[model samples]
Target: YTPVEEKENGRMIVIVAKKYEGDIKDFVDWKNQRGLRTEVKVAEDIASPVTANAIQQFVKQEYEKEGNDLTYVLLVGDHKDIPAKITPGIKSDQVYGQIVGNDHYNEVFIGRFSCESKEDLKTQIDRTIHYERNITTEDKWLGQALCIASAEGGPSADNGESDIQHENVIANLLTQYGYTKIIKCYDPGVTPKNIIDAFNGGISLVNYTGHGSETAWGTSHFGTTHVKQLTNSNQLPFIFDVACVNGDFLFSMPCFAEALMRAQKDGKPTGTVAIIASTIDQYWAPPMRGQDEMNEILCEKHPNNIKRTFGGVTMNGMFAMVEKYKKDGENMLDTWTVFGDPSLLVRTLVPTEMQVTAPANISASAQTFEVACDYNGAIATLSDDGDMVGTAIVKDGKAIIKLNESIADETNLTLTVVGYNKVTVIKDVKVE
Candidate 1:
């Protein structure tokens, strides 16, 4: 139920593809540098996927441990590697209960980084670093949004399913939320030039609906070619590519999701931070629930306040959608998956959380107090003022910071406290 933090790392583990253990280890090390307490395991070292239930149970067991509740899960392989069972198509089965209980889409906030080789995984990992550290000066692209409704195929005549209405459902929900700006493009409007323009002008999110193949969205709408054409560095949007095969990490060579994350032709870490993309042909399982639910979480839920990030929105959104689907018996979970770090964030601000309190008397020379926060990672506070204050590496929900030196007390002090969730909390501490 806890939301992800922008600054603090989470309790995570990567179930390796066995073949790429070294890459996964390197990935774990990189994650550690980013503040996440992580571990790596080969898929073969653990129980095989024949009973995907066993794997879930393994994660479940870790979650149940004292002080070690697992939050993020990275399955670094294809369905053939770090395997997953077709979620029980039946509603009456007991095992179905298990699938519903975990987080992600019909599972936990799990991610599948389906890679065949170490280099490919490194491609994913390094890009992940770019995004995990995806900096935002006031979330430059937060206000802007682009909605693409492909016209490649009109509503299917053979099936009168509501799935075809995905574009309308997704865009409308975001509109209802009232983003600072929302641009809608349909059919012809969803051209490569227009799509590229949106990226050029800057967009926080690029949402697409309709049909797609492994490397392209719709026959000619958006493709790998267009992705490479994009050059908006430090301003990449998280893509909600609600189409089939676009996220096929296992079968497709350099699939659409992969292409989007690749290095831009122009240079340094310019592209989507993560994507709610798919790995196989989507059959409109939950119709439009996943995309809509994800948006709701991004706009309305936790991290909904000033200090929020993409990773916070995405990780929490995964939990929300999965919870609703399980409870509502929604059969809409499909191939769509998070291709990047489930811990990746929607970062908009800088890390600055140091709350200082001066003793009632200004004559006091030193002071130290506890900062209470339930963030899962180590919470360390910062002294914003040029004073030699001290702090501790957090092992509990609260951290003790020492206050000393030439700082004076006042009502309008620019009080700051650096803590978990890469966000700065400003304060007007009572210095009367």
Candidate 2:
């Protein structure tokens, strides 16, 4: 067994194993050598319930022992009897909902033992425990947001592991972008309640990284039940799904994006301002590599930096890293065409114009108008009819606005503005 650290200050990571004592020891030793504090608990039974209960008990004890400062918990072991046993209690929905709770720990990592073979268990430990230093403090509310969902459990299985490696790589990249809060949900055991609860709580950006069936939508394990779908009603601002066949469905198909658009038409904020999705079946290796590369680029890191460094903020940076890898020699399938409004992706938010026009029945002389600008992004083109145009500016971690423009004509003229990520114009009306 690997020698365990009794205590530490940075963060606490718990590794639970069933029979792979040798693998667990190797992982702990590796993490300790890097100055990371880790504790390993091995349960006698290799079953899921047995191992999960052991983990919960261990975590409760650790919390009491450490005054409840544990940062995250990680489960490392195989699926043989493990997932089946734990699936009853640690369903994906429960994990998803719990992780999103305001009172939950900073982050949670449930890495199955399958990941131990593809990448060193030590690397997984490092990725989970390691984070960029003080990036969140650089600018309050300046960090990026990230959400990871693994409903299907195939990619991990095909690659000789779980999706933990890919998930970790993405997490490290987001840390570079200065995203302090990240929520990850990997439930082959997800339920509708779990999915709804997580989104209702709040997740700025979301990623679904797992297997999917044509019918299962974005999940690997599809049953005939209709309750398994992930749609726009979830109300996440940004969403990325690395599952197969999700992005390939036609716009009319009940795929993820379509659901968001439907929500928008119904007067809800279901439409994601931006999306990075695939249009066809996705291969495992390339997309994984691409995602890692995209993360690095977003953080302004060099191409080679991926091999050297691990964590950062920008979740977009991971996509940037994937783009760079494609430029190198990886196949194009690694990155499917990016979708959504381009304006939302690159440009900072800006203000447009305000105008006034005469009513259709009124004389042309009545159509005359004037305009003025203000310090805030607002434009009061005309002073009459209580008309004012306002713009949003970032100040002290909050959005500040000033109105300047106005219109006086009684005619029904349209006020139109475009956002950076999408071409769809936002329109408002003025009435006299």
Candidate 3:
């Protein structure tokens, strides 16, 4: 407890399974470069909770050694390596909100990479870097949020009010940070069309307050089957299912939250890159909890440079209300879980405009081209059928993209350029 005096530092403790040692370094480098004093700790044992316990042990040891608050904790593997256990949630509204046990629920905030392979880990890291690196006028999408408050179709399963509160609070918090374009999908207004469209082309952060299940959001309205229908392959938002047991990681086949994290479309990831969810039944109380602090950290303090972590924000809310209100706050955060690398950046962007400056001609087979955009220092990725040909960093508002013969010899390619948060834009690249 004395570690409280150590001052919370933007440092992450990375505990990884040995088999994946080859992969953790990139994660380490990614965070280190971004401002976090990140270090990797190879777990000497196995599910020995070994995956979770290592993090706990390190926390105590590191706190004693540095006298600094380790902001977040990252576990490299999921399901197989780290192993699993029963976890619980507090809200009765949650379809299942309760847990048997696991290490993710720690004295400090922690999240794990739901990964099974080195390539998957690499892909996750690559996507994160791709999303966070560019800072441009178009990145304003970071502030663009999608807030949905449950279905008020009568007290049938009434949660729309709480859900609306989630939206209102988040919007209020983000307004100061530049979040203007918000999609409020409240009640009957929230249909598949709105839900899909918002995710397809609107913003970065998506929040839904209300009822949930292991497989669907809002009474089977949006279920696992719809995951692939998402066409937002290029502009994926970070999703939050702030309701019941949609994220119960243990029972009931890959909970809704997991399905979201694992969602893909036409061979490309189509859903949220990360999810702030529940592993047990989510019990809702007054003044709101998880979403409150989530809004603060993602918008207020530091949107970039590792200032605030997803888990960090969640913990703060849990404690804030916990200290004042006690049990309510404690339960709210207990069931909460983060489904992604906790060290990732939450900024979103959809660039305003992008035009091909080089020969309108392009190549999937060894070629070169230049892209011009309003946002300088933007990154342009040339891809064919979702496969990357090359990525270029904009300089002087222009970037030269060199694609090797590896690019499809003859195929339709999409050029998606991202700058910070929702400030991103994509266009079709034709084969010459």
Candidate 4:
């Protein structure tokens, strides 16, 4: 049995097997040699119901302990004769289980294994770990405080160019922002109430990237009966709408853009910032993969600066980035066009700075002391110590302290700690 602590990337992949002990051992050795952190659990016989229960309980316990951060769970075995049903709850979606074996051994077993072949699993796992590290270390556009809507889907499910364009633009934006946190209603089943709820729930930005039909009161979309006419209640601080004819001056009546402006002027939250709207049908690409390269770019980049403009926070920085990419020969046909005030797009806030506060009181015999750092979004690291103890980013500004055990017979110990934007020191107190 491989010690769980030795697992790489703090993750484990589970595999269950009934019979084929020799094959299982071979698999384990194969995984171990490939540098995968795996553990195998074998049952005495598949016919033993108690053995199955024991394996199930063991896996459940381990899953609960490390389920949240688990990358994947792969089940492999032949328990057709044995009812080794594995029904994962909501917490486990990375699990993939399949039985493989001949009917002979009446037993069930479980093991932690990576599906990636021994030759490839190491590289894949390493890459995944590295990617995650980059995301946490280098990616700044992961979480977004924005809401976007694409009202292209009607109740009747019309696959129009406008709908496709809407999705394309939204996907691009998500890629730029890394799609960490996004609020969207792409389904026709979504109602106006849902939109309002999302706004009230703290969606600072809103993007209406789809077709809108002009109505007497405001812009409307088909099959969205649940959404009454646009009202102050449904308006967001910032809105961008893409629609053909809606932007036409010939319409005369209040179009969706006008209605949004009216709501803003009426002291609705919509007035908090900017509005971008269109008077023409935006072009779109059909059969676009959900995760295209352009879309990936949008999901990966977020503006580093948040500018306060026109009485509200704007994402103009991101827009500039998008435009720059477009000017670089990237396709913009299916990309988004501004529908509201472009000036309203500006950075809202800077990433939070973190710093370590030096601990007080030094021990005469203490060799080292611990320090703490507090930061909102900044990463952290420690210095001074030759070993260079790594720093962990504390989401809520908290980290554990491990005093240097090697320090001894010292009157006092001093250590330097550093954070992304700040640094400090800690002193050890003499207990003697």
Candidate 5:
């Protein structure tokens, strides 16, 4: 085992399929511009065979390296281009992130693009960029959440809580986090239409805890077909589904996770911005520990103080479950997968505008740049000619970016400020 690197902010590694390598550059650049230091690796160039084990080894090595600070891993292909680790009826991309101890603590959070063609891949990328970059005129939905649950396994199950009971806890947590509306559709009283109607009306988060198949949630009978019927364009929610097989993207059938990501209406994104779900059948209860941690991260419940990114929630949630149950519940850690950009900051509340203070110009001989921001946890990045030169995390309303080398006189540098659920701010400064 190697010593863990102490990092202040998150970083990402994108493993793209050979076919999509050319197209993924823009997305990677956008990620860098938004303050996540990103590195891309073509699946074909990853040693030999490009099997899941080899991929995991590469990630582990990168993660263990000093100052790499890799926190997110995005596999940009289907199972054919970059295989998932298959073990005893389970398939997962999460193994690549489980680079730490003998337990299920994930050193990094992992996600999958899961697209088979260029067009489909572009759609996914466009949706993510649009979701992050586009300004919403009507953002009331951002403070709304759609929580659905089944009525099974009440208090006598492994985790000693009913599905509805679990979701109720999360719903209350959402309230504490300042959610304006909490839509609860519990089973025995829920229907497919109820869920579909809720989606059309728009919500920021669609959380579920129930039984599921490869393509649908069992309680509401909502699945791919219902996802196709959605009209929530540009109002996509970030989904957290604690169920079985909804994220079975390697299956022959069109999976539920992909359906949420890839669904469109009249050429507009009509489903979730991202999703966290499972690749195989799940236990009745242990996985809820992870789910609870997910909402806890979203709500900024202290000690679980990770970023609000999808990867942060998923990774930290698994860490909670594995730490709580040890051997008994780690299967959830192995089986769950994040299906979208792992670094996409999940917008929970209406994004607050940020105020930034930075120099209008810098000396060419300067080695350090500092910026003050109104929001804590904001990331500050300095870039020149599309290449990132420095990045830092804002703490106590300040970030100091240390450049690796001196810049040329008259070179234009871009300073980007990205914060938790805050609008992004970009400013330009020139070296004197």
Candidate 6:
């Protein structure tokens, strides 16, 4: 019931398997340094038996606490370790996010690690950290996008456009947002090779609207095998697919979306950063409504002006469709899943570096921190380990952050400054 704190990135509740807590510690710290308030809870600690219902109950409790300010819920394990709510025809982590009201809308965005092995979890962690922390302003791949579509679905399904038409609309939207290039690989002349050449070259976003199964997209004949051969290391794209069963992570073989999330080339990540896909056979017209709304939010064209985080876009888009189509919309909300961190800020444009000034050292008992920046309304956060010590917004070219508590002793802290469409700046200061 509590809303996000003003000028803050908001809190993230990370539920991890006990065995992987150490592995997830660095990720939580990274998120805090980047301005997100993060908390980690192991599955065994959530409940005695650790059932899906128990997990949801714990999340609901935390979300309802006074000054909750919760924004993202990240589950860090496969179904076996953390469990998914089993609805009639599907398994979903969506219930954990539908905490605000009696409706199907998501009050908080949700994502999963869905990893069964430590190695797999490590791969995901490495890639996500690299994608967010190491990307430079000159990385041109962040402006490139690939949209793949099927030429079928010829204007049928209760006024739904063809797949190519749908994909084209999103491609045009990206162009309007000033993307360097929007590559279209539509069927009737598309092939797996064409998709690979453009994809491997480098792309930051990929949208696929067509038929799909557990392991492949029907239009371009691309599958998990192709994902395994990728060489675009460290050039990961955020993928959104309007298709069937591509995100079926519970399947015996690695699903198409799962393969993309886990792909690596010689120990370097070459797959997507995250994916939005369906776990079941989705209906024709309804899925388009959700996908179209997603692109609208990503391009800052939505009325709600939701944050550009991957989970925010996906959850809010699905909520919009539910408001439009009711039962069908609810079905879409139930099935579509985010296969990455829900709090990831989708990098759609070329980032520009920011000019920031702050103290390099502070008193051991200091209670206030200040940052001078070039941009007004920039967010300034100070963190130590995985704890957010303070967060504030820039006003009149300065941010005065009031820490929650006094520093007890000498130590190092990380300061992160971020603004809309600006390259994040991270600095280290000592407590002396």
Best by TM-score: 6
Candidate 6 minimal-lDDT segment of 10 residues: 1-10
Candidate 5, 314: how far from true, in Å?
1.7
The residue-by-residue lDDT of candidate 2 on 88-132, one tens digit each, is 212220121122234221122222322324233433333222211
Better candidate number, 1 or 4, judged by TM-score: 1
Error of 5 at 39 (Å): 1.1
What C-alpha lDDT does candidate 5 achieve relative to the native structure? 0.82
RMSD of each: 8.9, 24.9, 10.7, 21.6, 2.6, 2.3
The lDDT per prediction is 0.55, 0.37, 0.58, 0.34, 0.82, 0.82
Among all windows of 10 consecutive residues in model 2, the one with the lowest summed lDDT is 129-138
**Candidate 6 colliding pairs:** none
Q: Rank order by TM-score, top first?
A: 6, 5, 3, 1, 2, 4
- After TM-score superposition, the amount by which residue 115's alpha carbon in candidate 4 deviates from its true location, in angstroms, is 61
Q: Write model 1 residue lDDT over 97-184, tens digit each, in one string.
A: 1343343333235666656566556666766665444433455566578777655443441123243355556666666765567777
User: What would the per-residue lDDT of candidate 4 be over residues 1-432, giving only the tens digit for each residue?
Assistant: 000111113233434444334444443332222223345444443225524455445545555564333322334322332223333211111111111132111111121212112322222223222221222222232234443345445333223334544455564565455344666566456655566555455443445544455531122233123223334332234443444434322234444443333332232223223343333343332112211322332233423332222111212222233333343211221222222322121322223334555445544444444445565433233322223223333456555434434434444433433222122223343334
At residue 245, candidate 2 shows an lDDT of 51
Per-residue error at 391 for model 1, in Å? 11
In candidate 6, position 322 carries an lDDT of: 80
Task: Determine the backbone clash count of candidate 4.
Answer: 43
Stretch of 10 with least lDDT, candidate 1: 89-98
Worst lDDT run of 10 residues, candidate 3, spans: 91-100
Candidates in order, TM-scores: namely 0.65, 0.38, 0.66, 0.31, 0.92, 0.94
| Number of backbone collisions per candidate | 24, 48, 38, 43, 0, 0
Answer with 2 or 5, whichever has the higher TM-score. Answer: 5
- Clash-forming residue pairs, model 5: none
